[PDB]
Amino acid sequence: QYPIINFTTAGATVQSYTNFIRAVRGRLTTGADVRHEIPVLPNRVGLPINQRFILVELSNHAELSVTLALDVTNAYVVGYRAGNSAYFFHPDNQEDAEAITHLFTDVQNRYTFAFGGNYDRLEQLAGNLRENIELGNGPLEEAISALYYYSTGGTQLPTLARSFIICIQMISEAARFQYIEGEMRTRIRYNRRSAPDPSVITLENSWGRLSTAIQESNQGAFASPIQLQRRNGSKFSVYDVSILIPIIALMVYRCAPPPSSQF
Ligand SMILES: Nc1nc2nc(C(=O)N[C@H](CO)Cc3ccccc3)cnc2c(=O)[nH]1
Ligand SMILES: Nc1nc2nc(C(=O)N[C@H](CO)Cc3ccccc3)cnc2c(=O)[nH]1
């Protein structure tokens, strides 16, 4: 029922990854909500359950497959399926707990992790911060295998957490930010794995705040500036939506758009 987007790390190229991220965005946003040229994800309020999730089927060179489930309201990876088992992060509320019962309904074994799926929790379990976890095609290839083998005992909990961190950034964060997509394209082009620099980290950390600032803006102008970081870690001040158009690809719904107010 839910749309499926396929990607493989096997012989991945800049183009195949670009096609994948574009398709993910296409299934996440409906086209109904575009503000300052930036699409907004569907509002959770009144969103029918048959429109709530998308599925990302990840394959690798090792001939293994896992399916991630993404919530369309925030691009959040809520859980995954590998063969006869499915695993969901501890839901943040009762609504999201009910919603996930509509996922992988034919699977033999259903588990809900006792831990939530946010970076802070996953970093704790991994024993490493995002800034020390390498990203790229190699890490993703390995992440798919680690997720696949979890139910049989082959994957340590820190490895599982690290593997989620890799998947979330290379799929959800890349979907959210053209900038992060670009950073992943670079890694794929040269087949060189590397941890995300401060520009990537601060964008990830600022997605919610940027979404709200843009939506609350006065004709694009922020009431309060947002501080981002450059690749070298130096501060970059954001005063306006204009500078973000090439950077942010989609936003979480935060408030209803104000009337057009033409002159
Ligand atoms: N499973 C899963 N987890 C995710 N976790 C995060 C995440 O933890 N983001 C954090 C908290 O909102 C960003 C942040 C905000 C403010 C200060 C510091 C950091 C983001 N995206 C996902 C995601 O797509 N799938
Ligand atoms: N479906 C779903 N969504 C979740 N979202 C959050 C979360 O931290 N959301 C924040 C604040 O509302 C917004 C946000 C910020 C950055 C990236 C993604 C979402 C936490 N857990 C879940 C969860 O268990 N299932």
* Atom 1 of ligand 2: nearest residue by CA position: 71
Give the ligand 2 atom nearest the CA of 208: 15
Q: Which amino acid is at 180?
A: I
Residues marked as binding for AMP? 76-77, 117-119
Annotated binding site: 4-6, 11, 46, 76-77, 117-119, 137-142, 191-193
Cβ within 8 Å of residue 24, ≥6 positions away: 5, 54, 56, 70, 171, 175
Would you tell me which CATH number, out of the four given (3.40.420.10, 1.20.140.10, 3.40.50.300, 1.10.569.10), belongs to the domain 4-190?
A: 3.40.420.10
Resolution, expressed in angstroms to one decimal: 1.2
Q: Nearest-CA neighbor of 10 among 142, 147, 133?
A: 142
Among protein residues, the one whose CA lies closest to atom 23 of ligand 1? 76
Please confirm, yes or no, whether 76 is among the known catalytic residues: yes
**Determination technique for this PDB entry?**
X-ray
Measured from the alpha carbon of residue 41, the closest ligand is 2
| CA nearest neighbour of 85 among 114, 109, 103, 101 | 109
Instruction: Tell me the CB-side half-sphere exposure of residue 250, using CA atoms within 13 A.
Output: 29
Closest C-alpha among 2, 1, 7 to residue 167:
7
190 given a catalytic annotation: no
The gap between the terminal CA atoms of the chain, to the nearest Å, is 45
CB atoms within 10 A of CB 218: 8
Domain positions in the chain: 4-190
Is 176 an annotated catalytic residue?
yes
- Given a contact cutoff of 8 angstroms between Cβ atoms, the answer to whether 27 and 3 are in contact is yes
Q: What count of residues does the chain have?
A: 263
For residue 165, give the nearest of 188, 149, 142 by alpha carbon.
142
